[PDB]
Amino acid sequence: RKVLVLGSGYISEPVLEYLSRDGNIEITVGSDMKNQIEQLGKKYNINPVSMDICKQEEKLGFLVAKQDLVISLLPYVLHPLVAKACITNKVNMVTASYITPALKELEKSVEDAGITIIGELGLDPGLDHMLAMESIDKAKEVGATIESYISYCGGLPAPEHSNNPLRYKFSWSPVGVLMNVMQSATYLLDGKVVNVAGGISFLDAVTSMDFFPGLNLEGYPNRDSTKYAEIYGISSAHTLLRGTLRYKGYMKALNGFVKLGLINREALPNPLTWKQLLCDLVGISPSSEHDVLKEAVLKKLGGDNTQLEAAEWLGLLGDEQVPQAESILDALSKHLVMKLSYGPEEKDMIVMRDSFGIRHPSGHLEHKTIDLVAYGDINGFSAMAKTVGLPTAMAAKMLLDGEIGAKGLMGPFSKEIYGPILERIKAEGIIYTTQSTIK
Template sequence: MRNVLVLGAGLVAKPLVRYLLDQPGYHVTVASRTVGKAQMVIGGRPNGQALPFDIARDGRALGTLVSGADLTVSLLPYIYHVQVAEQCIRHRCHLVTTSYVKDAMRALDEQAKEAGVILLNEIGLDPGIDHMSAMRIIHHIHDADGQVVSFRSYCGGLPAPEANTNPFGYKFSWSPRGVVLAGRNDACYLEDGQVVEVPNRRLFATRHTIHVEGVGDLDAYPNRDSLPYIQTYGIPETGTMYRGTLRYPGWCETWQKFVELGLLDLTERNDLEGLTFRQLMARLIRKPETDDLERDLAAHLGIAPDSDVMMRFAWLGLLGDEPLPPERTILDVLAAQMQKKLQYEEGERDMIVLLHDFVAVYRQGLGARPRKEHIVSTMIAFGVPGGDTSMARTVGLPAASACRLILEGQIRLTGVHIPVLPEIYEPVLDELARMGIEMEERVERLEG
């Protein structure tokens, strides 16, 4: 019997847990702060067990849980992953997460190797499928004596076109607070050999438009720091390295105004209780609450009172007399209101768009001109109406596949890893393709 411990039963847990429960000889324990969610994810399966567990309140129980597992999957917030990893090392238990590797996790590499376990991170969608699908193409280019001279990668979780029914062009398929927090990030990328640094206050102002076949035009803006991926992906030759986030048009221009207004402020405050949204807006622009608030707000933001941005503010309820939700920061007020308004209706589908854009140059022999190719690799994946979201499938199933491959000895690596090695990404991508999750590639010859 192979014993798997899954910590957390949130939005992406169900496809992962169901996959593991379907494997012969597997027992899966789902430990969650809300045991009812864990029970729902297990769905009454005899080889599953639901347990109540709150790592913030009962960290000492973590070791007991991990000690009974061969592999642990942490779907907890990333701040707990190192704590989980330390217990996994102590009890010689493998670990899988879908989160970005932080320095504290990276520092456990030697200890994990000594314990003979792998701490595999970034094995979801973004990060995850993006790494694996990019590395497959990069290794193919290098194996053909080519060089990657430009690489751009974009990913976004969006409503399917028929479910795109609100002015923001967005509905939540993962943590609303996580979406809003991501708007506070700085960004950095390489463009034609020049490093471009983007402070948070300009993040959404740097948007550009890309066209995705079958979807249409989308807004793209930079996602965190792209520069480390030059080394991670093994492409020191590239002059362009850009990782971006995709949204429907209109998102970026509105979020730029959120930033300018201070709606992403994480300062804890005790003066929010009893306020309405309209009163909060008046305070943020330091104006009295009057009938002219819309005009004053538009003037403060440098936009027309009848602009699309002002329409979105009004639709979200930011100009109304509804009381603020009971939160301590303005960012959490915004996240709570967006969670309330930007929900999927029953039967609506979400959509994942992942796109890689490469320019590769191949040597052709003595005296011959190099051959240049433009490679576009795209995945468009839809959720199942009334079933799993595409976000849950594309985050949960890569991690689930990796769990099986580790437990069955097909991935034998130890230490801290992300899925950029063929030993990891080849079998995972092959299995995802069998489940209908795969990239489609288009190659065109470039002149010059």
Template sequence: MGSSVAYVNGAVYVDEFDQNILNVDDNIYDASCSTGTYSNQVRAMRRVELSCRTVTTAQPLAADHPRATSIALDVSSPDLDTHVASHDVVISLVPFVHHPTVIRAAIRGKTNVVTTSYVSPAIRELEAQVKEARITVLNEVGVDPGVDHLYAIKTIDEVHSKGGKVKEFYSFCGGLPAPECSDNPLRFKFSWSPRGALLSQHNPASFLQDGKVVSIPNDELMAQAKPYHIIDGYSFVAYPNRDSVPFREFYGIPEAETVVRGSLRYEGNPEFVQALIRMGWLDTQERNWLSGREDVTLKELLRRAVGADSDEEGALISRIQELCAFSNDEEMERIVSGLRWIGLFSDRKATPRGNLLDTLCAELEKLMSFQPGERDLVMLQHKFVIEWKGGKKKTITSTLELLGDTNGYSGMAKSVGVTCGVATQLMLDGEPALNVAGVLAPYKAEICDPIRIALESEGIKLIERTI
């Protein structure tokens, strides 16, 4: 049978005329991945079906691909099974909670699946059915997760082959505005959901340090952010992200005493987000007073959020100082100025969305989206502290600095879309390690190496240095 690829909100690559891809996509960011991030060979060869919730969203994505068609389709569609079954692979770039729905359709249709998301417990629960259907569900082939795995495994395997031990492993990644575009109080812009971006800074985290597990509650995560130098000219801070502990096993480094994976932001961002948390703005609980209100002002919402006596600016600032316990006057002035920039002290009408977080996001979407001519930055660095035979220690860094194109493709779209695309292409080309029945992720050289080599041919490569 010929090959076909289905794109459920995502990005695709294929190589033979008879192969079809279904791409199922659900958001603007993933849509950018589905366009323009394919190699010339892929553009010319494979059939791609691009799906979004509405056909008007999908049509522009298909315009640049000569063998692409566009349809309206999402995970709740009764036609999902039919579309999935008629393709050779489905690329699922829907929110991670919906991947199991796509995978179940793929099991019924005997269709392979590619995602850029972590293997969740819900996906892992489907592994027996995936194997029984003799299909491959390949996950974690974006940038983080994805590119990070490819180069972690490369360096770790090289160190082990020379008799060395990886005693410490650090990995930090950030999707950020380019420095010249980080021109707001959070020094951040949204190429995807503001909700998801903010909540990612309010998760608990665990990591290994000196052989011991360190756990950070979500309300204290931003207080863990520390200055982190990668390349001159950038003012990064880094903080741990979710659970790093399993990666000692995933990466095959039982000798490691410290394992930390985390995120990057620009200086000043964590303090601002921490203030928002303390004021209650990341609260997702539904509030009656945030439903059905069209006349409420932002300063009235701020008063309700912080519990101030009135919505006069002086009273609001006084209450904010009580809640936030700023470290100094300079920090207080900077954050209050930022709140003023958002409009939270103003008479401007709010856009209530049922809870404080989504109501705040309604304002941030207007103020902090990328504008024409602006570009983003993907920065990723691994740091390995190596112990060689005889006890001598060296540090190896592996770094990706990828800027988006002005009025072109973003760095995030390129790094996620191309990685996902070449992995899909390799699967369809019959790469043995990418055609094993089961739930896969790139934690072994036989999976990582072919993807990494193909990715480098597309110009995405981490630069390694020994220091």
């Protein structure tokens, strides 16, 4: 009956709420942000401890030894420091993030220490693995084989709050997100490695997603889908597709910013204004009421009015001061948060769509679809916080109660982990359904 929560940010709040229901656990919290931990201590009964991870490793060793379990809700670079204390002190661990190559090297040491370290929990990586392996294990139980695996997931605002040029709202500064439009995408299609070029030509790969008629979505492949053959164990499959869901016109609006030359890490040029900045990008002197409009509309896709109106709406042509930043990308990101932030009583939404093609030994081809949908609570937590938070907290509770016997470094791929979690998420307001057809 003792747990340490390293981190005091977005994901930490729903984790503390879930554990505090039963009322038989001494919850300690460790973080850098002094303003966050004091406000969090008012709501939930916890033991606040100011502690740096890298600089103050000494007190971490003494503190972690007292506890039973360690819930790491920190950035994924710092997990080897947290895991190093666990293997020496002989205590369990849980993570809501990627198992990195650095953490993979400790796997030999973790099994020798005789402790459990679960990783890759939450939304993605997390619930995407659990839904996939549930369906893949069910197929292999009846002698079937996986021929195709198409999957899509997206964290969005609720439809009612989608009335803006991007049809989106940012929780934090999208510095890492916007630069990923320039990256390529790779996936498998009918036994052929398809490669999609990024940047300006990436709008060609954005297709309509009409699986929910009422919801007006679009979709596109991301990063790398061939990776999931070895992980899930479906090398026989002829198709492997992983993608992201957005509302229609999102990618076309971002494509406008790529055309103007805003998506780059070059430095900036009386305070600077947005009217003056776009004049430098297009290549004119800063003096233009409606002359910069004619210059911008010419550059934007050869007279794209929708992209011009989007820049007009955000105030990129008008007279507004540019925030202090290291680059043009950081200036755009800071402005997008200021203009398109979440309100006090505005919901968010998670949608996840899987589609399996399962060949049975009888000869028939089963088409199995899986939907997972969750809305954010008005007087509660957001859908993103719940889907990322609750699987980590549930997995932690299983270790304390003694419902997981396996040892070593591991994901949520085994039925011992994912089975209980998928059953319990129904009560937390995260509903998922199944539909099957044969042909």
